[PDB]
Amino acid sequence: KNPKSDKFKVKRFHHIEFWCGDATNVARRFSWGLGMRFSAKSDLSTGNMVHASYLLTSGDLRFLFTAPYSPSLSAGEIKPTTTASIPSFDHGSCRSFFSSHGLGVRAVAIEVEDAESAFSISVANGAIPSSPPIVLNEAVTIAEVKLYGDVVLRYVSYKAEFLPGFERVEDASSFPLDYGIRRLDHAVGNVPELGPALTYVAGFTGFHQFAEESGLNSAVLASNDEMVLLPINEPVHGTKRKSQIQTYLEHNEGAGLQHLALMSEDIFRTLREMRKRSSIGGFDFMPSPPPTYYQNLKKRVGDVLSDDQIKECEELGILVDRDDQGTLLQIFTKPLGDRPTIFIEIIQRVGCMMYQSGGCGGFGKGNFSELFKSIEEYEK
Amino acid sequence: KNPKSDKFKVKRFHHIEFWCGDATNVARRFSWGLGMRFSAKSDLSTGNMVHASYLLTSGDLRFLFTAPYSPSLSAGEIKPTTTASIPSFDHGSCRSFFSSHGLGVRAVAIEVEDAESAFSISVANGAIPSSPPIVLNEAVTIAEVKLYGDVVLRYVSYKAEFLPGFERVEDASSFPLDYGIRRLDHAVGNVPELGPALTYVAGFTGFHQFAEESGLNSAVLASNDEMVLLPINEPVHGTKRKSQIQTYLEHNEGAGLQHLALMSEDIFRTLREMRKRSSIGGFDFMPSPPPTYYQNLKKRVGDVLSDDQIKECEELGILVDRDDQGTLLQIFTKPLGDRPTIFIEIIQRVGCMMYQSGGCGGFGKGNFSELFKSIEEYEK
Ligand SMILES: C=CCN1CC(=O)N(C)c2ccc(C(=O)C3=C(O)CCCC3=O)c(C)c2C1=O
Ligand SMILES: C=CCN1CC(=O)N(C)c2ccc(C(=O)C3=C(O)CCCC3=O)c(C)c2C1=O
Ligand SMILES: [Co+2]
Ligand SMILES: [Co+2]
Known part of the structure; x- marks a missing residue:
């Protein structure tokens, strides 16, 4: 709706x-x-x-x-x-x-x-x-x-x-560098309490909720054509694994922007180019999923990505998630600076063609469970 | 002495x-x-x-x-x-x-x-x-x-x-980058008054003065083997061209470190490598001297550098100066950050072999006059 x-x-x-x-x-x-x-x-x-x-x-x-x-x-x-x-x-x-x-x-x-x-x-x-x-x-x-x-x-x-x-x-x-990034897909805030933050922002914008225990609850506010997307996260406390939202709030001295998700027109080229530069001044990426994660992609997205395209995801450490409408390719940098606060996400979305509608494939919340499952599976 | x-x-x-x-x-x-x-x-x-x-x-x-x-x-x-x-x-x-x-x-x-x-x-x-x-x-x-x-x-x-x-x-x-830089040759301070600064530092170190109107007076303090070299500059006021030392003091909110001079074992390789990267995240260099500057190097250092080596200096914008004992190759970056304050010098020294003695060739003060002369000569 x-x-x-x-x-x-x-x-x-x-x-x-x-x-x-x-x-x-x-x-x-x-x-x-x-x-x-x-x-x-x-x-x-x-x-x-x-x-x-x-x-x-x-x-x-x-x-x-x-x-x-x-x-x-x-x-x-x-x-x-x-x-x-x-x-x-x-x-x-x-x-x-x-x-x-x-x-x-x-x-x-x-x-x-x-x-x-x-x-x-x-x-x-x-x-x-x-x-x-x-x-x-x-x-x-x-x-x-x-x-x-x-x-x-x-x-x-x-x-x-x-x-x-x-x-x-x-x-x-003005050297014409270009690794394929093309636009801001979404911008995500971390707050101590999700409810009051959503009420405030939706209250003054009229943005609507976009249709959707790893330590967070989140919701997404969206403009009329759902091209402006503002997810907000709150921590879930007492989870046995400390909430990364709570760690953020501690090191950031409170609420702030958690991540920027940057759409690429070719996420494979973008990640090849960024990973070449990680140790020579660029950005590092979070540790890649175990191979069991990619051994499980066939059942999940085998009708969207070929084996070669899945193998290319595995080479680059790219995560995949799926909506009822489309599919998301995503990967996350390590924090951009000294503090374990802000980081970047690179994404590319497939499906929902009309132009492509905003938020096609979702935000990858399915990858919390699937990455944990892959980790225990690779423990084997 | x-x-x-x-x-x-x-x-x-x-x-x-x-x-x-x-x-x-x-x-x-x-x-x-x-x-x-x-x-x-x-x-x-x-x-x-x-x-x-x-x-x-x-x-x-x-x-x-x-x-x-x-x-x-x-x-x-x-x-x-x-x-x-x-x-x-x-x-x-x-x-x-x-x-x-x-x-x-x-x-x-x-x-x-x-x-x-x-x-x-x-x-x-x-x-x-x-x-x-x-x-x-x-x-x-x-x-x-x-x-x-x-x-x-x-x-x-x-x-x-x-x-x-x-x-x-x-x-x-830990990517093994190496463009040829090997050690700190000297570290230079800008102060409002040279006299009191020299008296203070020489007073507590015992460092001695090292044997030597563009807007500055300077002197160099040196350790016993003249391997620790600490030049200090003060502005010269009312010069018609505003002293770069005074500009520094204004934008820096007072005295501070003006430049670090980094010795290279191969200044040609270092500058090739640094200039390749100037517009892709690296450092920029000050505008190069006019060709009349290099047309005048033959008379100045034609017995130290070949024509090809002089031409290679011209390709890279490298400055040359000479002591009574040795020769200096040097070049200067633009400021390292937002403010027109600190910058870097790349240097290589030739002569004064015993190992090489510290400060061989001096600090390039001769290039204030010679660069100005070349600029008016190229005006032609
Ligand atoms: C960077 C390391 C932590 N990390 C670890 C990890 O394993 N997974 C699987 C995800 C998956 C999706 C998203 C994400 O993009 C997102 C939300 O978390 C909530 C909805 C809105 C939104 O955009 C993030 C930030 C992370 C994640 O951060
Ligand atoms: C960066 C742009 C301004 N600039 C412009 C310019 O044209 N020339 C020729 C020189 C030459 C030598 C030195 C230098 O290294 C030095 C002294 O100035 C004083 C004695 C101690 C010392 O090490 C500097 C900083 C500059 C210079 O700064
Ligand atoms: Co995201
Ligand atoms: Co110097």
Whole structure:
């Protein structure tokens, strides 16, 4: 069931913003690890005396990395005279965020028809305001409300490249890396209590619940066309194996973004390319399932994947799960930074063709049981 | 003249420690950019609930990257029960350092015969104590005094791998990168006033001045065998071209480490390898000199480098300077992080064979004039 209850017109995920201590080093690491090209910048070289922001792109996926400069560089500015390109930025907020949580996502940004109306309707329906609508160069409107923890949901709307005040990156600095990643499929939050978090977010967005003891309960909120997908997890306590959600909440100092799932147009190429780079600056992957897991894929998805395609999943450590409508290929990185908090998921979905409908195949919750079963089976 | 006036027995540069917001991302970026292998770790996986520290090595060069965890993880600890592997570490100090200065060097570490005696003699001769001598696992002693700004000079001495409590890195995570870098040649500080900084450091070390308007005055302090080399720069004001030392001091919020010069055993291979990676996660280099600079190298070093070797310098943008005793090949990166503060120099020295004596060929001060001359000549 999809009641299509969005309280304002939502388009697609627009970008994800990381708050960093040093944006340059995080962005360069991510660029090489994920195959994303440097596309835009806002920093001292573009007249921004407040923050350094670097944009990476792969297809429609946009990762923004932002860090504060010394406040002394902008001490004479006021908000009417700011040189910041992102008007919601605040030195103290950014330093406090990073000290509390470490490297992680500050903003989940969605493009909407009218960011001012989205903000007004959201706050009228219970959203906690974070940054009011600001019109940039009479061209783009940006507004922010609290999502969970210190993560904001950022609304962006365009009258008619990223944001005014950003400059396209010099091509010599813009190597055309591409490992096949094409868009953000979903963005997942960890919270102490799922119920109140769902009520709050669904309350101000009108997002509906998307149709679905390893230590979590989860639910998924979705926009009208189910292209914006926001799962939320809570821990399940006293499970004998400590909940990874609870570990997250401890090391993160509370609620925050758990993972970003990045859709690939060719998950086999993406994983070949990422795994080649894991130990030379890129990202590591979680330990692969035992071969019994792939010996059990024939009965589960033998009508979707050939033996060769299943063997290629086994070579790359890719997990497979299935809906009543489609099939999901997925794999998970180790944490992106020092803390056992945020990580990345690479996914590709097969089925649900009409274009492909959002969430085809689900989110892989079936792989909690199937991976445990494979592990005990391989114990043999 | 070398009075050999060291007040305690100094051996060699031991390591350089960067204080970071996220040690993982900086270390992975540096590993790929410089060709350094992951050699040791101290972090949650080794029982350290205080800080994440990752060691990169290339030859004898040791780069350590450290970031603080949430203080909550270690809130019940006291110094007698600490799980930190580096006892001088302090969450507040590290966060304050990084907020003030951004990514940069906290510790210049030299190996000495006896870190306790080096500390005592240093403080008796005016050194400002930073961290008292602490014996780690009855095997290694570490102590710290202030060098300049918030940079410390760290003394390390060994009774008889890096530090107790560090673990050798799993080989799968230890890709054997190597672009030819072999050791730290010198470490350079920027200060507002050169005179008082030289008097202070030479005062407590016994280091002697090493025998030598672009906006700086500098002098070099050296140990008895001139293998530990610590240049210090001050700005020259009112120069019509703003002093890069003054720009540093502004963006860094005061004195700090300006550059690390890394000796390569094959500077041509090192630069080929680093430049291949500049736009795919590595380091960028300063804009190369005009061809008139290389058209003028024949008269300057035509008896040291062949035409082909000069042409190879031109291909890679390498600078050349000359002493009365030897010749220096050098090149400079763009700043390592967001702020126009710290950068890296790659160098190789030719001549002064006895082993090669320290500082052979100087520090390239001749290239201020010669690069400007080449630029006006190429204006033509
Ligand atoms: C990274 C290591 C832990 N891990 C271990 C593991 O074995 N399996 C099988 C999964 C399977 C699916 C998902 C997942 O993507 C997801 C949910 O967990 C809840 C619904 C929404 C959502 O998107 C995750 C995060 C993990 C997982 O995290
Ligand atoms: C990075 C861009 C600025 N730049 C521009 C430039 O054109 N030249 C020619 C040099 C030449 C030598 C050195 C240098 O290594 C050094 C001293 O400056 C003082 C004595 C001790 C020392 O080691 C530096 C840092 C630079 C330099 O920084
Ligand atoms: Co997921
Ligand atoms: Co130098």
